[PDB]
Every structure is written in structure tokens, then in C-alpha cells.
Write a protein that binds this ligand. Structure first.
Ligand SMILES: [K+]
Ligand SMILES: [K+]
Lengths: 688, 688
């Protein structure tokens, strides 16, 4: 869809069209060609100012000024053939065309014939062809050399160093003059169009200024006639109009009626462009607008006389110096603002002594969430005895940490220069701010919030431990005030003591994404502290999964005996459950449990056919016994209990096995009737 | 808090302070104080225009124009004594003070002396005082009668029919002139401050225009002198300046330097205010800068040509006629916009034949959600075979319902004039749109979306049934074309049984508020559904117990048997909920099953110790026998299940109750078991 936007994308394709072939076609940014563009601009300015002066004030040029306009035509005849070898920075397909058939074309159907007619000698042709008046009107073709001046004001309007509404004013002020030069030349020419005997019916032949009479006006010096005509044209253009010089003919009345009608529109356009420049306000009135919007809300909220002088100081600081333009920056998205922040703040954050060699992603997460702030001298930022809500890094300036003993004894603890941080020994700790950080010189602090430097400090636990090691590998803070806190927060175990607990709570709640974000960054253990549990002992069974993917990941060790003697098969089968005990047994789960016979006798005694069939179905041999070496059939034949020893004996258990009293389950079952389990034991007994 | 809000508040308390006492004080907005505020306005205009003409052009008035300035002074002394009997609106409050001591004061410390010493006859005590030309400078105090005109231009920006910026240029055009009348008068006066022998060194005494020499200028008539001076002052004010009349003295040079310096900033202020009038632009360029924003997005999206006319026909219906300023409506809050909608739209919706006999709160609930729309003729709105998504109410204009059957031709089945809403029978009779409703005259449709006219229809179900039974059934409601469909609108399945389903549905998961609202809007008479269930059936135990209070519910009859034979306590015993089976004994709490003995006889065979304890602890009569005259204890002894026959025999059951065989449970236990249950039922056999 880049064919739709060829301007927003594909801006500078440079590679495959610089030196295709022909080795001659100059790119229109060459330093040897832009030294010719100014030369032809000076020649075009001269040749457009002299052309109405050649038309109006002469009838054929004299014998002097002949080599001058000969070389003036030569310096443009060079530029005529030089534009066949200049490229074609294009409009729609944004690439400089080098093809010298699209250079000969796009020029021959453009400003060539108006620029080739204007290099014929029109005052040798005039003096050769019988001195005809209408062949001297072809000098006016040479006013097409104001293209080189209007192209200069188009290469200046797209120059961002100068405001475009100021280049429009300069363009209108170059249109205002040279329309008074040309009007002066035409106003003198309309006096030369009458014969010298009718010179008393002209604007200049009938002129008398002071004691000087302008009679026989073709014999006055050229710079008196030109200054007289230009004085008329400029006091007419400015609409002063003294009337010492005025139109007398009808051909001068018509020209003045055209010329003041042009200058009225031109002066109204100049006033409009100047007003449009001024309504785009300056720095001082954009300061004073929000300053009077902030004096109110400081007069009706009744803020104190010191907080008012701090607010006015910061408003006068964001204007008049230090143009912090984040309010313009907020249109830029978060990725490009993060790239700007990694360009601007990484030279300052990487030299902070708190971050002695952390990971680059952690410093990236720091510099993503930074803010620039400026404070005047005398400000208090964090005072002693309050909670720390922001972490500050001094980019440049000079700060001062102080402390008081009893009576306001403000002694200089340290002087926080550039590449220093304060508020760092209380976000790590949970204590008050220990120092009144006061400002000495105009500073440029970088502010990080407390909650950001808890989230990115608990996520990046290796770098957090590195930060705590940077804090303790010091003089143990006796450089400041010897406020030693234990050894900070000491090594607090986030390797195994809390991270195994964190991944186990992630398995218990059933969060698969938190589980795999923890274990895919390494650190998958098989043990919890404070117990013998595992991320298989929790999730898999007791929780019974939440999330079916909790068993496939990494193949963790099954049959791990915990602190209470429970394998994860036993935890999966106690809560009953029927997916993990169907799924764990193919992974090699086992029912290892000490005194399993006594446990089976207690589950006979309570009475739970579902629990005991899940024990036997998931793998259990009911010939293991207790302290009196009694099989579960020996207790399932004690209190009657049919249908409980049936599911035992279909799972496989012999009848002939004695006890402390020397009784088998045969005659132990001979306390109840014939159907009551004695037929069952005898026909599973004599079946082999 | 409200004392800050003084003039932005209630502000209408003049009623108590109107005529306390003092019996003379005229209210400012009287009618006889508006035949004075224009009479002496056109007296103040005359006296303010004549005062520089009396000063400049005369050296004392003639014997005529004597009664004129006599009555001109006595009219202003009539005003100077009539301003003592006029109340005034206070500045900081908004109450008209009527106290005739704060009328004499606030006036005497204000413009009273400048309106009293400009009321002495300054021509009578000039000519009768040994005439000195410095008691004629006290005529200029009568230019404090321009207070009336600037008060008229202060009581004109309070009006709302004209713009406040057009009044600020009309005030400037009254300041532009009369600063040329005063300048003409005190430009002629500076010519009369020279002696008549030095009259050739003035602007008028040395003047010669045409062939008329202005010599001995004190004997020319008054209007030639005034027109000459005013012509100079007006061609100077406009900065034209012909120079036929110019300053000659030094006092006239000084006055012209003051005057053109004043008129320069006055003309710049006029140009600025006229520009500010045009920056707040007109509607014919508020349309053109909106429509060229709609030329793109109709070219960059490549729309059709009938849609590009349908779009642009609605933006010259927004602007250029029918000024719908609803974008200026949405900053008004939703309560006040609801009151606006109740004021405007309610006579339109009250006359729609859809709503004949609806409740007032229903009509108030649909007029909040309306929208105004305008359509040009020829447009279709809802075509045939399309899903309806809006409901339309016609205000004015004329629509046309059209339907096409086979050949593409349409027939005018109904002309929809005002109060002839359409789009109604495709939401109640929930089918596709059956017509192609086309605009034949510029209309004012009121749009309600389909989703709101489902929610307000289902909430107000009585008004919904009222809508779908009164809908032109007296005039065969398919009265556009035939529309052969059996039972279109007459109770197609929404009845007074479905709210019982809604109570049962909300009760099944438990809500405490939807069933409470449905029994407040309706009732709880234990209405049922197909299976004979109840809210006591579902809310208690089918869906498991949500609140304990679901079983009381202001008094519900317990033991309501459904079609299956289940009671709401049998649902408890099958479900569990020992707190619910503790609560249900408060009511009658019977367990009437016909095969209750067979149900106990099969629950001793399935095998249940907890379910049987919930059966017997709630009251079950645990010796009732099945078809074979077998008790529950009969089967519990024949199968020989210990711990279940115990639970039967402590709950009260006869142990010698025989069966169809005549076989007691005594010898049934002896044939089944050698345990023989002798400390279980033989000891309760010999208990009697
Ligand atoms: K002007
Ligand atoms: K002028």
C-alpha cells in the first residue's frame, strides 16, 4: 500500500540511480552546481532590475554598456545549455531522474523558449532593423529571469531555519519593490512616448521642484530622472502621494489607475501576512497567557506566598529558557518515545554509580519510564522525615543533601553533582527520607516513580541483587551519615527461597502464562522451601491442574517424597481426581508410601469405596501390612464389610497370611455369615 | 461557599425591595424612563454636536439661537433633578437599591458636578461679564453629555439580537466621526485666534479653492466655513489628504500632528475590529471548509456518484438552511438535555397512534433516546428485505411507503404524513422491513434505534402488550398492502407465564434482586412452568443454595409437589445442604412420596450412608415397606450392610415386621450373618 503513500514512505531511495550511465548528469545538490546557482541568481537579479531601466530610460543602449550586456547574455547562454545536464528531482515518483531524454524533455516543453528568446541581442536587432519601436518590447521577455528569484524563495520556504510566514513577508517585500522600479521605468517611458515639442503635457516635462525646472528632460542625467520617477513610484506605493509629481496625460492617468489598484491589493496582502505572523504568538505572550491563567487559581485557592513564588518560578523557567517540549512530544507513540529516551538518557543512567554493571534490558526498562524536571536554586525536593515517592537522577546541576541534629543545624552532608542519585536508599529500604535534598544550582533531574522501581526491581531480581550489592559495597553509607540499615535488605532469597514459592503459587492459582514465563527464563526447581512440595506436588494434583498443560512441561521428577510423605500420585489420587492419575501412571508414577498397609486399613475402617478403588486402581498391592502384620482383608473381614474386600481381592491379594493372633482372613471372616465374604475367599482360594 | 457565587446565582430578589417605602423612586426599566432615556439621548447628541460648533465658529451666540440653548440647558437641569428619583442596579450584588440616600450618594461622588457646571448658561455669563475668551472654555464641560451615548452603546451590547463585535465597530464609527466634527471646529478656532490683519497666515484666510478666495473669512456664512473645515478634517481622517487645505501656522501644525497621530491608532483599531468580525466567519465559509474536508474521504475512499450526492445534500442541509446546531447541544448535561427532549419531542410522540394508552413514564423513557434528522426528497430510508435497526417518528414533511412484488414497479400503499411513524411493524412483528419508505417532502424524522426499543419494550411489558394489542386493529393493521401472515401481532407467545420463567431462571442461579424486582413489579403467587416447579424448588436446592433467605421469601407454602413427585425438601436431601435441611423444619416439612419405602429400599441397595442420614434425620418414617412388604431394614439385613442398618434402627423401626414370605428380619439376619446383630436389633426386640 506504499503506492498510496509515496511521500510518507520510500522518501530517499538513493542507491540504484546515482550512476546508472552517461557520467555527466549532475545531481542538483552538487557543491560546484550550487556555487553556480548563486552566480546565476545574482545575474538574474541584475538582469531583471536593468531590463526596465534599459527599456524605459533609453532608446537603444549606448556604446558603453555593450560588453556588459554581451557578457550578461553569455552568462545565461551558458545556463541554457547547462540545464540539459542537470537531474530531475521529481514530484510524484520521488527519485532524481538521470535519463537525458527526460532532461531535454520537461525543459523544452517548459522554461526554455522564454529563456532562449531572452538571450537574443535585442538592442543589436533593434539598431539593425531600422530602429523600430515594437522590437524593443521583446526586452520584456528577460523578466522571465525572476524564476531564479522565485525559485530561491521556494528553496527558502522549505528551509526550516526561517519561518515560512516570514519568507512570505520577504517575498512580498521583494514583490513590493521591483514593482516600484518597473513602475518608475514605465512611468518615465510613458513620458518619452510623446514628441519633444509636446513635452509640456507630460509628468516630468511639466515638472518644477524647488527652483529646478525639468524642461528638456531627455538631456538630464540618468540618475536624476530615475530618482525622480522612483520617488514618485515609492510615494505612490506607500499611499503618501504628495502630488508634487502627478499624472498629466491620459496614458499616465491610466497607468496610475492600474498601479494604485495593484498596490492596494499588494499592501492589503502584506498587512494580512504580517498579522498572520503576529497571531502565531511569541514566547512572552504564550508565557503570560498561562501566567494569568495560573495567577487566578492561585488567588482563589489562597496558596501561600512561598508556594506561589515556586509555581511562578517554575512557569518562568519553562518559558524564557529551557524549552521543555514534552507537551509537543506526546503525539509521538511509545516505541519512538522509548527510542528517544534510549538516545537521550542512556549516557546519563549508565554512569550512575548505583547501576554498577546491570543488564541492558534493565537499564532500558529504567530509561523508558523517566521524566525530565528542572528546579531553581533554593528548592526542597525530598525533605527529611517523609516517604519517598520518586527516585531522582541528577543529570546536570548541583544539589545538596543536609540533615539536622536538634536545632536546624543544616550541615552539608554531601553535594550531589552530575551522575548522582538520591532517594535510592529508601526505595530499596522501607524507611523515611533521611536527607533534605536542597538545590544549589539550576538542575536537570531525571525522575523515576516508586512503583516503577518496584515492578522492574522485582521482575529483574538478578539486577536487584546487583543493586543491593552496589549499595552495600560502599563505606556502608558512612560517607553520608552512617545510617546503616542491617546490611540493607540483605540477600533475601529470590533464587530459591521466594522464586520457587512464586512459581509454586503460580502453579497453585493455575496461571499457565506466569508459570511458563517463570520457568522458560530458567530456575525450575524440584523443591519448595519450608516444605517438601514441588510445582508437581501443587498444581498437578491438589489443584488438579486448572490448566491442562501443567504436566507436559519439562518432565519434572515424579515420585518425589515430600516433607509429609506424599508422592504427587498420592496427592492426585487423594483429591480423587481422574485425569492426572490417568496421565501420571504412563509417566512412571508410583505409590511409594511408608506404612501403606496401615493407611489401607484406616481407609477400610472409615469406609470409602471410591477412595480405596482409586488407591488400588492407580497401583497398590494389598498384601502390605501394619504393626500387627494384618492385611486389609483382615480388617475388611473384621466389621463385616462386604464389597470392600471384594474390590481388594479382585485387585489381587492372598487369603492365607496370618497376624499377631495367628489368624488368617478365612476364620477372621467367620464372624459373619456364609454369603458374607467367606464364599468369596474360599472360591478365590481354591481357584489355584 | 455560595457567597463566592454572587452574580452567577439566583439573582431575582427585587420583588421584596421594590416598594418598601419612599413612594417616588422610579425603576430603571420603566416605560416613562424609556421615553426620557431617548428624548434626552437625542438632546445630548444635539448638544454634544453643537458645543464645539458653538465654541469654534462663534464668539458668543447671536440674539437668535437664544431660546434654543435656554431650553437645552433647562432640559438637562430637569434631568439633573430627575436623576435623584431613580434607583440603580448595584455592582457587586444584583439588587436594585431603592434607598433615597444611596441615590443622592453614589451620584454626588460621581458625574454630578460635571453635569451641573455644564448646565450654567456659559454664553449668558460670557457676554454679561466683560467678555473674556477663557470663560468660553467652560463650554467644553458639556462634552460630558457624551455619557448618554456611551451608555446607549453600553445598553446595546447587553442586547442579543446584534453581535457584540458589530456594536464595537459601530461605537468606533461614532468615535471616528465627531472626532472630525470637533477637529473641524477647533481647527477653525485656531484660525480665529489670530487677528484679522494677520488672517493671511491661517489655513482658511490664505485659502483659495477654484476661483473663490476665502479672504475676510469671518463674514462668510456659517455653513461654507463648516463644510470647508469638515472637508479638511474628513479628508485628513481618511488619510487621503489632498493638500488643497493644509496647516499654515504653528498652532495648526501642532494640532494636525496631534490629530493624525490620534486618527492613526483609531483607524488601526477600526481595521482590527473589522478583521476580528470576519475571523469569526460566516455560514457560507463554515460550509466550504467542511465540504472540502468531505471532498477528500470521497476521493481517497472512491465512493460512487449517488452516494456522493446523498452525502453532500446533508451538509448544505446542515449549513446554508435549517441550522441544526446539535454539536452545541451535547455540552448540556444529560438531565437538562432530557428536559429539553421532554419539552420538544413530547407533543410529537404523544400524538403517534402507536402510543394510544401507554403510560407516561414509558413515553418519557423513549423521548430521552431520540434524535432529530432531516432528509431531502427522493431518498429511501429503509428498503425492503433489509433488517431494521431504527424506528422513525415523522414530525413534518411527507414520506411514502412503497412495496415492489415482482416487476420492479412500486405502489403508493400509504403516504406517511406527520404523526405517522414507520419502522414499527418489523420489530414487534420481528421480520424484515416490508416496505421501501421513500421521502417525498423535506421531513424532520425522530430516530430511535432498535436496541433501545427492545429494552424499553421488555422492561415495560404492560406497555409492550398495550402497544401490540392497540396497533390499528380497528383498521386492519396490515393496511398498507395485504401481508398475509397468520397471527402477526396478537400475542404470538409472550404471555403472563413467561415472567414465572424469568423468576425461576433468575432464582436458579440466585440473584436477590431480579426476582425481588419481578415480584415487586408482579407478585410471588408460586407461579409455575411445564414441569410443575417453583422458585422454592430451584432457588433452594436444584441450583445449590445461594442465600439462606431464598427459602422463607416473605412466606411461601412448602411441600409443593411437582409432576415428578419431588418436594423442595426431597430436593434438599438429594442435593445435600445440611443448613437448608435444618432451616426447612421451620415450615411444615413433609416428605410425602408414594414409593418412599421403595426409595429407601433402593437407596440401601445403591449404597449411601450420608444420603440415608439426610433421609432419616429429616423425617422419612423409616419402616414403611415396598410392594413385597420389605422394610428398609429388611433389605439392609438381607444384604447385611453394617453401619446402614444401625442408622435405620436408632432412627426408629420395628424389627419384627415381616414380609410377604412371613420371614422376619430376625431370621433374615441369621441366614445372612453369623454376626446376628444381637446388640443391634435383638436387644430392641426384647425392649418391649
Ligand atoms: K491606509
Ligand atoms: K495619502
Amino acid at each position: 500500500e506504499t503506492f498510496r503513500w509515496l511521500d510518507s514512505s520510500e522518501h530517499r531511495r538513493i542507491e540504484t540511480d546515482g550512476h546508472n550511465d552517461y557520467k555527466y548528469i549532475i545531481h542538483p545538490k552538487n557543491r560546484w552546481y550550487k556555487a553556480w546557482e548563486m552566480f546565476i541568481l545574482v545575474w538574474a537579479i541584475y538582469s531583471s532590475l536593468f531590463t526596465p531601466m534599459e527599456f524605459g530610460f533609453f532608446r537603444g543602449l549606448p556604446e558603453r554598456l555593450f560588453v556588459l550586456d554581451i557578457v550578461g547574455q553569455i552568462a545565461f547562454l551558458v545556463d541554457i545549455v547547462l540545464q540539459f545536464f542537470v537531474a530531475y528531482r521529481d514530484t510524484q515518483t520521488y527519485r532524481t531522474v538521470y535519463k537525458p531524454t527526460r532532461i531535454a524533455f520537461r525543459y523544452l516543453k517548459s522554461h526554455f523558449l522564454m529563456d532562449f528568446i531572452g538571450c537574443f541581442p535585442w538592442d543589436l536587432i533593434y539598431k539593425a532593423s531600422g530602429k523600430h519601436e515594437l522590437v524593443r518590447y521583446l526586452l520584456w521577455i528577460r523578466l522571465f529571469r525572476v524564476r531564479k528569484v522565485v525559485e530561491f524563495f521556494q528553496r527558502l520556504e522549505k528551509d526550516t531555519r526561517i519561518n515560512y510566514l516570514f519568507t512570505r513577508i520577504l517575498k512580498l517585500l521583494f514583490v513590493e519593490v521591483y514593482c516600484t522600479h518597473t513602475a518608475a521605468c514605465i512611468f518615465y517611458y510613458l513620458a518619452t512616448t510623446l514628441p519633444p515639442e509636446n513635452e509640456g503635457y507630460t509628468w516630468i516635462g511639466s515638472l518644477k521642484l524647488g527652483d529646478y525646472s525639468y524642461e528638456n528632460f531627455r538631456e538630464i542625467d540618468l540618475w536624476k530622472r530615475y530618482t525622480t520617477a522612483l520617488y514618485f513610484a515609492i510615494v505612490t506605493m506607500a499611499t503618501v502621494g504628495y502630488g508634487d509629481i502627478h499624472a498629466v496625460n491620459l496614458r499616465e492617468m491610466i497607468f496610475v489607475m492600474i498601479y494604485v489598484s495593484f498596490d492596494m491589493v499588494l499592501g492589503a496582502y502584506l498587512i494580512g501576512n504580517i498579522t498572520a505572523l503576529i497571531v502565531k504568538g511569541s514566547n512572552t505572550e504564550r508565557f503570560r497567557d498561562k501566567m494569568n491563567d495560573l495567577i487566578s487559581f492561585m488567588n482563589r485557592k489562597k496558596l501561600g506566598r512561598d508556594l506561589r513564588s515556586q509555581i511562578t518560578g517554575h512557569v518562568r523557567l519553562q518559558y524564557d529558557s529551557h524549552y521543555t517540549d514534552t507537551v509537543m512530544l506526546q503525539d509521538i507513540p511509545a516505541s519512538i518515545r522509548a527510542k528517544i529516551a534510549q538516545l537521550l538518557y542512556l549516557p546519563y543512567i549508565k554512569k550512575v554509580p548505583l547501576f554498577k554493571g546491570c543488564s541492558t534490558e534493565f537499564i532500558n526498562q529504567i530509561v523508558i519510564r523517566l521524566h525530565e524536571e528542572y528546579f531553581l536554586p533554593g528548592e526542597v525536593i525530598t525533605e527529611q522525615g517523609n516517604v519517598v515517592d520518586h527516585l531522582y537522577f541528577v543529570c546536570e546541576g548541583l544539589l545538596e543533601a543536609l540533615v539536622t541534629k536538634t536545632d536546624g543545624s543544616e550541615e552539608s552532608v554531601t553535594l550531589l553533582g552530575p551522575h548522582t542519585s538520591f532517594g535510592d536508599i529508601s526505595i530499596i529500604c522501607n524507611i523515611s527520607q533521611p536527607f533534605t535534598v536542597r538545590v544549589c544550582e539550576l538542575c536537570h533531574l531525571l525522575r523515576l516513580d516508586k512503583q516503577s522501581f518496584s515492578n522492574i526491581l522485582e521482575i529483574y531480581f538478578h539486577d536487584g541483587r546487583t543493586i543491593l550489592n552496589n549499595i552495600m559495597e560502599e563505606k556502608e553509607s558512612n560517607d553520608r551519615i552512617k545510617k546503616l540499615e542491617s546490611d540493607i535488605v540483605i540477600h533475601i532469597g529470590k533464587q530459591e527461597a521466594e522464586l520457587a514459592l512464586k512459581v509454586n503459587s503460580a502453579a497453585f492459582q493455575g496461571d499457565f502464562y506466569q508459570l511458563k514465563s517463570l520457568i522458560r527464563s530458567g530456575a525450575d526447581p524440584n523443591k519448595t522451601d519450608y516444605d517438601g512440595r514441588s510445582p508437581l506436588h501443587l498444581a498437578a494434583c491438589r489443584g488438579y491442574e486448572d490448566i491442562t498443560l501443567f504436566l507436559i512441561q519439562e518432565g519434572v521428577d515424579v515420585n518425589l517424597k515430600d516433607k509429609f510423605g506424599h508422592t504427587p500420585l498420592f496427592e492426585a489420587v487423594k483429591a480423587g481426581q481422574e485425569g492426572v492419575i490417568g496421565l501420571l501412571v504412563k509417566e512412571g508414577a508410583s505409590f511409594n508410601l511408608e506404612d501403606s498397609g496401615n493407611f489401607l486399613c484406616t481407609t477400610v475402617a472409615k469406609g470409602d469405596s471410591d477412595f480405596l478403588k482409586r488407591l488400588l486402581s492407580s497401583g497398590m498391592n494389598p498384601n502390605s501390612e501394619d504393626y500387627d502384620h494384618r492385611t486389609p482383608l483382615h480388617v475388611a473381614a473384621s466389621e463385616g464389610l462386604f464389597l470392600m474386600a471384594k474390590m481388594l481381592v479382585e485387585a489381587g491379594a492372598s487369603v492365607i497370611s496370618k497376624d499377631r493372633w495367628g489368624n488368617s482372613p478365612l476364620d477372621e471372616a467367620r464372624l459373619c455369615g456364609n454369603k458374607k465374604l467367606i464364599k468369596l475367599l474360599e472360591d478365590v482360594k481354591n481357584a489355584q
